[PDB]
Amino acid sequence: DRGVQMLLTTVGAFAAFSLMTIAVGTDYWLYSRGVCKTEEVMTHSGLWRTCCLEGNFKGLCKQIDHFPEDADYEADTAEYFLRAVRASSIFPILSVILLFMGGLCIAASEFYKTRHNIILSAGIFFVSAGLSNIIGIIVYISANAGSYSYGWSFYFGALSFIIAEMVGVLAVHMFIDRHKQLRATARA
Amino acid sequence: EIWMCIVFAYIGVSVVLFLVSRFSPYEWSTNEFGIFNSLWFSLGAFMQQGCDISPRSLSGRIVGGVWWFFTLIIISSYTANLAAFLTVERMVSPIESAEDLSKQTEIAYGTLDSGSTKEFFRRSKIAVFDKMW
Amino acid sequence: IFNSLWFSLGAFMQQGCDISPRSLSGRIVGGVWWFFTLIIISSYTANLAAFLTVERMVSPIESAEDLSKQTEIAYGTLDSGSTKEFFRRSKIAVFDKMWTYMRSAEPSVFVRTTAEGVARVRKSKGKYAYLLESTMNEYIEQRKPCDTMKVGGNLDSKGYDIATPKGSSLGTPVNLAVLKLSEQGVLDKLKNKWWYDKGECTSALSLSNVAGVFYILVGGLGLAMLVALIEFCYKSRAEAKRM
Amino acid sequence: GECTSALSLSNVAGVFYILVGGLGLAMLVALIEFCYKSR
Amino acid sequence: MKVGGNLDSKGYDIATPKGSSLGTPVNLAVLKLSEQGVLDKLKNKWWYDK
Amino acid sequence: FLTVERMVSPIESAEDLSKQTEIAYGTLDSGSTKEFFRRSKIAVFDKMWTYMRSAEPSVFVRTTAEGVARVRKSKGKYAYLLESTMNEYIEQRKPCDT
Amino acid sequence: CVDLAAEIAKHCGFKYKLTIVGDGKYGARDADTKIWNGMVGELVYGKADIAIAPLTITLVREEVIDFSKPFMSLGISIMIKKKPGVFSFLDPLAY
């Protein structure tokens, strides 16, 4: 059903965008033992800062330092580039932006029924968003290379990637259905 | 993390293959790479079990090639690491210090009911010793 | 040409093929390529297994006996002091062989000063080890730039004591004071304050090991999407302009 | 008394030689068949 | 198995009654035995060799 | 399997015998070999002697024939230290099990 | 050492004056003239009344001056000097 499918796409796009925005915003990406507001205390670290949990300074948040220049070590340029990319958080932000563009294209497709090239575009964005998410995830885990458990924000981001992929598939299905219907109509 | 990234990469590869195989109306279909068929092809490629169908377009073949390279590297890494595990036995020590005992709670630990060790533990001014007592 | 490239790529990855050569020459090419692929892939898997197995069995130096056995990493004490006498008069086999390696070694692993010794250890990128007092080692390990580590237990046993002139009234009271300070833990607290409080210092394959293949896969997916988009746009423009 | 590395091309040069020899043999066989058919 | 370092510092000493002539001889003997490393020899013999 | 098999090295010296404990080893109950092992300073010699004294069950053997029999019936869990010439003679005797 | 001296003074109820050894040596007997130096030598000749420093307990020092029970144990110990590349999956085969 065209209406049911469009409702599903809108709901999925909204859910994916909300999940990715929450994952980028909140701090429950990982649980690990570390320093606070700079002893070792079990804190929760996200994408921009880490906050203590059941500690002496519980509730205090300190911005995570992605450039360990205390000893002034550079090693190779690959590590420097990876640290810069992780600190900028460019890929989760790009995933959020691509999801927003996909949702905007989804909304704007309802205005112009004749032009189908918009709907396909939406799907592409969704797919692209998912790819970015995957890259970000890898980068994040690579950032942890230089006990630990993953918080609910990480799983929210993974769910956002999955839902974005599903929405992209269903948008491609809409594009195919629209073009097939147009061909069937114009054949006669 | 490797397994979860494998699952996510498989999902993304299947979606991208289906998109690049079906989205073009000029393809319509000449190929058989639906979403279910894309998932089946990706699963078969990962397990190195062949495929009933193979992509014929340039983009679909690029996707298939990168997925095949990823699958080869991952399977070889799994086999090599399993061989390394089975060759050399490594025995870990769950407890290696007093603060390690203090942080954990699974393993019990105690001193004499009355002696130098217990009285040393009862009255201490160090955080680790205080936690242990 | 495109189909031959696809067949060769599929054969190297040992994946499914939609076509196979039928002529004798094409089948000769296919057979030699298949043999080459089999040998290369088996060699890669075996070399990775050897890499990981040798990595797993690497044993870092943790004891004095381990240092005594292996001679790749040099080690030596000061040019004089109590370490010299201890190693010279030690009848233990491990310490005796350590001393025999120490005296008969070129270049001289001996050092003039403690600061010179720690500097040499730092600039030897792990090739030279130092044998010094455990307290000094613990103090050095807790200083910038966080590169020296005390490993293993003590070779001998010594102590620091409060010194008094022989036949003095301050001897026994100081002895009891030291014993009491030891009992109530003030000495341990002082050691923690001046050594740690004021300091300035697995088996499974990780995602960092195989991050490059993930990057390559995502880049290939993006490139394929871009190529499909370019072809679709060109076809759309051609169709629009044709009619 | 004073007294794993990556696989190099020399380790697998034989398989490369065999591959190139097979390619040359296939080219020769195809050329022979074409000449025979033309004759 | 024994894991980690010692939590504190303690020593075993040879006890001598107060105001007796054996105490200082005994202290010098203990220090001399420790210096030559013979105490390590008895510890190794009675702990690890046996 | 193949890697563990390939890294197994047999004993080819006194030092290798001393370093391990899997295959036991001992000398005659009372003979010049026992006195030589007791009276030595070379590291491997006193390591093997310390193995002798702390061994249980006793690795010492009253007579040469009993020691050869003990080596033979242990299927390779025992080692005998004896005169080189007599040992070379015994190795060249039937049924070639030493 | 300063904190330990303060604790010892508080336990014994005395006031102290800190002085650094003139020659900057721990102290060792000289075989040429049998003259003690360092802090142990300072104590022997009466310049100072008590030494609170990392002074190792040795027989040659115990026979000439008194030593309290050790306040810090030590020994000879070993000091030693202490990430995969992104494309490290190509390592098993040479470039």
Curated annotation (Swiss-Prot), chain A:
Provide this UniProt record's keywords sorted from A to Z.
Calcium, Calcium channel, Calcium transport, Glycoprotein, Ion channel, Ion transport, Membrane, Phosphoprotein, Synapse, Synaptosome, Transmembrane, Transmembrane helix, Transport, Voltage-gated channel
- Which molecular-function annotations from GO does this UniProt entry contain? ionotropic glutamate receptor binding; voltage-gated calcium channel activity
Keyword Mitochondrion set for record: no
Q: Taking the first listed entry, what is the main subcellular location of this protein, grouped into a coarse class?
A: membrane
Record field: transmembrane: 6-26, 88-108, 118-138, 156-176
**Coiled-coil boundaries:** none
A single GO cellular-component term from the record reads:
Schaffer collateral - CA1 synapse
Single Gene Ontology BP annotation = eye blink reflex
Expression across tissues: Brain.
Indicate yes or no for the key word Transmembrane.
yes
Q: How does it sit in the membrane?
A: Multi-pass membrane protein
Q: Where found, per UniProt? A: Membrane; Synapse, Synaptosome
Q: State the disease link.
A: Defects in Cacng2 cause the stargazer (stg) phenotype. Stg mice have spike-wave seizures characteristic of absence epilepsy, with accompanying defects in the cerebellum and inner ear.
Oligomer status and interactors:
The L-type calcium channel is composed of five subunits: alpha-1, alpha-2/delta, beta and gamma. Interacts with the PDZ domains of DLG4/PSD-95 and DLG1/SAP97. May interact with GOPC. Acts as an auxiliary subunit for AMPA-selective glutamate receptors (AMPARs). Found in a complex with GRIA1, GRIA2, GRIA3, GRIA4, CNIH2, CNIH3, CACNG3, CACNG4, CACNG5, CACNG7 and CACNG8. Interacts with GRIA1 and GRIA2. Interacts with MPP2.
Function of the molecule = Regulates the trafficking and gating properties of AMPA-selective glutamate receptors (AMPARs). Promotes their targeting to the cell membrane and synapses and modulates their gating properties by slowing their rates of activation, deactivation and desensitization. Does not show subunit-specific AMPA receptor regulation and regulates all AMPAR subunits. Thought to stabilize the calcium channel in an inactivated (closed) state.
Family (UniProt)? Belongs to the PMP-22/EMP/MP20 family. CACNG subfamily.
The protein here is known as Voltage-dependent calcium channel gamma-2 subunit
Parent sequence residues shown: 5 to 214 of 323
Swiss-Prot record, chain D:
Give the free-text PTM comment from the record. Palmitoylated. Depalmitoylated upon L-glutamate stimulation. In contrast, Cys-35 palmitoylation does not affect cell surface expression but regulates stimulation-dependent endocytosis. Ubiquitinated by RNF167, leading to its degradation.
Q: What induces it?
A: Down-regulated in the pyramidal cell layer of CA1 in the hippocampus by global ischemia.
User: For the lipid attachment S-palmitoyl cysteine, which residues are annotated?
Assistant: 35
Organs and tissues of expression: Detected in forebrain. Detected in dendrites of neuronal cells. Expressed in the pyramidal cell layers of CA1 and CA3 and in the granule cell layer of the dentate gyrus.
State its location(s): Cell membrane; Postsynaptic cell membrane; Postsynaptic density membrane
Q: Where are the transmembrane segments?
A: 12-32
Q: Which domain of life is it from?
A: Eukaryota
Q: How does it assemble?
A: Homotetramer or heterotetramer of pore-forming glutamate receptor subunits. Tetramers may be formed by the dimerization of dimers. May interact with MPP4. Forms a ternary complex with GRIP1 and CSPG4. Interacts with ATAD1 in an ATP-dependent manner. ATAD1-catalyzed ATP hydrolysis disrupts binding to ATAD1 and to GRIP1 and leads to AMPAR complex disassembly. Interacts with GRIP2. Interacts with GRIP1. Interacts with NSF via its C-terminus. Interacts with CACNG2, PICK1 and GRIP2. Interacts with GRIA1 and SYNDIG1. Part of a complex containing GRIA2, NSF and NAPA and/or NAPB.
Job of this protein: Ionotropic glutamate receptor that functions as a ligand-gated cation channel, gated by L-glutamate and glutamatergic agonists such as alpha-amino-3-hydroxy-5-methyl-4-isoxazolepropionic acid (AMPA), quisqualic acid, and kainic acid. L-glutamate acts as an excitatory neurotransmitter at many synapses in the central nervous system and plays an important role in fast excitatory synaptic transmission.
- Family the UniProt entry places it in: Belongs to the glutamate-gated ion channel (TC 1.A.10.1) family. GRIA2 subfamily.
User: Know the name of this protein?
Assistant: Glutamate receptor 2
Curated annotation (Swiss-Prot), chain E:
Protein localization: Cell membrane; Postsynaptic cell membrane; Postsynaptic density membrane
Q: Where is this site: Interaction with the cone snail toxin Con-ikot-ikot?
A: 32
Q: Which residues form a coiled coil?
A: none
Q: How is it modified after translation?
A: Palmitoylated. Depalmitoylated upon L-glutamate stimulation. Ubiquitinated by RNF167, leading to its degradation.
Where is it expressed, tissue-wise? Detected in forebrain. Detected in dendrites of neuronal cells. Expressed in the pyramidal cell layers of CA1 and CA3 and in the granule cell layer of the dentate gyrus.
Expression induction per the record is: Down-regulated in the pyramidal cell layer of CA1 in the hippocampus by global ischemia.
Instruction: Give the comment on domains.
Output: The M4 transmembrane segment mediates tetramerization and is required for cell surface expression.
- According to its UniProt record, which protein family does this protein belong to? Belongs to the glutamate-gated ion channel (TC 1.A.10.1) family. GRIA2 subfamily.
Subunit structure and binding partners: Homotetramer or heterotetramer of pore-forming glutamate receptor subunits. Tetramers may be formed by the dimerization of dimers. May interact with MPP4. Forms a ternary complex with GRIP1 and CSPG4. Interacts with ATAD1 in an ATP-dependent manner. ATAD1-catalyzed ATP hydrolysis disrupts binding to ATAD1 and to GRIP1 and leads to AMPAR complex disassembly. Interacts with GRIP2. Interacts with GRIP1. Interacts with NSF via its C-terminus. Interacts with CACNG2, PICK1 and GRIP2. Interacts with GRIA1 and SYNDIG1. Part of a complex containing GRIA2, NSF and NAPA and/or NAPB.
**So what does this one do?**
Ionotropic glutamate receptor that functions as a ligand-gated cation channel, gated by L-glutamate and glutamatergic agonists such as alpha-amino-3-hydroxy-5-methyl-4-isoxazolepropionic acid (AMPA), quisqualic acid, and kainic acid. L-glutamate acts as an excitatory neurotransmitter at many synapses in the central nervous system and plays an important role in fast excitatory synaptic transmission.
Its protein name is Glutamate receptor 2
The scientific name of the source species is Rattus norvegicus
* Record gene name: Gria2
**Which residues of the parent chain are present?**
742 to 791 of 883
